[PDB]
């Protein structure tokens, strides 16, 4: 069976928290976060990947740069493009810019992606436990989320269907002694280390797909 808790940050799969700043690019940070963990599982090397490469170059796949996008369209771009540049070689500037993808600087590849069954939190738990960090979308449009600081996030006004923010599930756990009580998903955001809990948020788990965390989850195939 699956572990009572998982935290891929403790195993070297997760880069330090990044900051998308004033650009609608959380989808790009969610996608690079999932590819960073899959490339680490494959090679043992953790290398920060370029969100800007995704913002500037994946319009053909249907993304809109700083005006929004989807993680699956990003994994589709990496596959069609044959690669993705490192954060070091293609730095983030938080504005739409000319595509400058360089194949010689590519440090990652994927053959497409796997989708988690929509709305199934236990399928998501199995993906997190057996694959690594998973890209997910959520409803983050609330002041309670903007000002989140600690504890299990639970917002009554949250939607499980109309999502507006891409994030990365890096694990799951529970508070207390009963592994089934006060469960939560461990989620990496892209609003900087300063937001929330060192840039992370615990979102309530197995509470009817709260905030839609299991509605549109996926991970790249490397």
């Amino acid at each position: 069976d699956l572990p009572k808790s998982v935290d891929w940050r403790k195993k070297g799969y997760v880069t330090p928290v990044k900051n998308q700043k004033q650009c609608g690019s959380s989808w790009a940070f969610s996608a690079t976060g999932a590819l960073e963990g899959q490339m680490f599982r494959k090679t043992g090397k953790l290398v920060s990947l370029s969100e800007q490469n995704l913002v500037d170059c994946s319009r053909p796949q249907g993304n809109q740069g700083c005006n929004g996008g989807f993680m699956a369209r990003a994994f589709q771009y990496v596959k069609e493009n044959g690669g993705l540049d490192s954060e070091e070689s293609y730095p983030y500037v938080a504005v739409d810019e000319i595509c400058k993808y360089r194949p010689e600087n590519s440090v990652a590849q994927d053959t497409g992606f796997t989708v988690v069954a929509p709305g199934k939190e236990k399928a998501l738990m199995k993906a997190v436990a057996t694959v690594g960090p998973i890209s997910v979308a959520m409803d983050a449009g609330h002041s309670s989320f903007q000002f989140y600081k600690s504890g299990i996030y639970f917002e009554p006004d949250c939607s499980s269907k109309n999502l507006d923010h891409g994030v990365l599930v890096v694990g799951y756990g529970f508070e207390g002694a009963n592994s089934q009580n006060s469960k939560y998903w461990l989620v990496k955001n892209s609003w900087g280390p300063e937001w929330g809990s060192n840039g992370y948020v615990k979102i309530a788990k197995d509470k009817n797909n709260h905030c839609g965390i299991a509605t549109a989850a996926s991970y790249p195939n490397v």
Binding site: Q20, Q22, C23, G24, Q146, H165, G192
Partner: peptide
């Protein structure tokens, strides 16, 4: 979503 952007942080405010």
């Amino acid at each position: 979503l952007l942080k405010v």
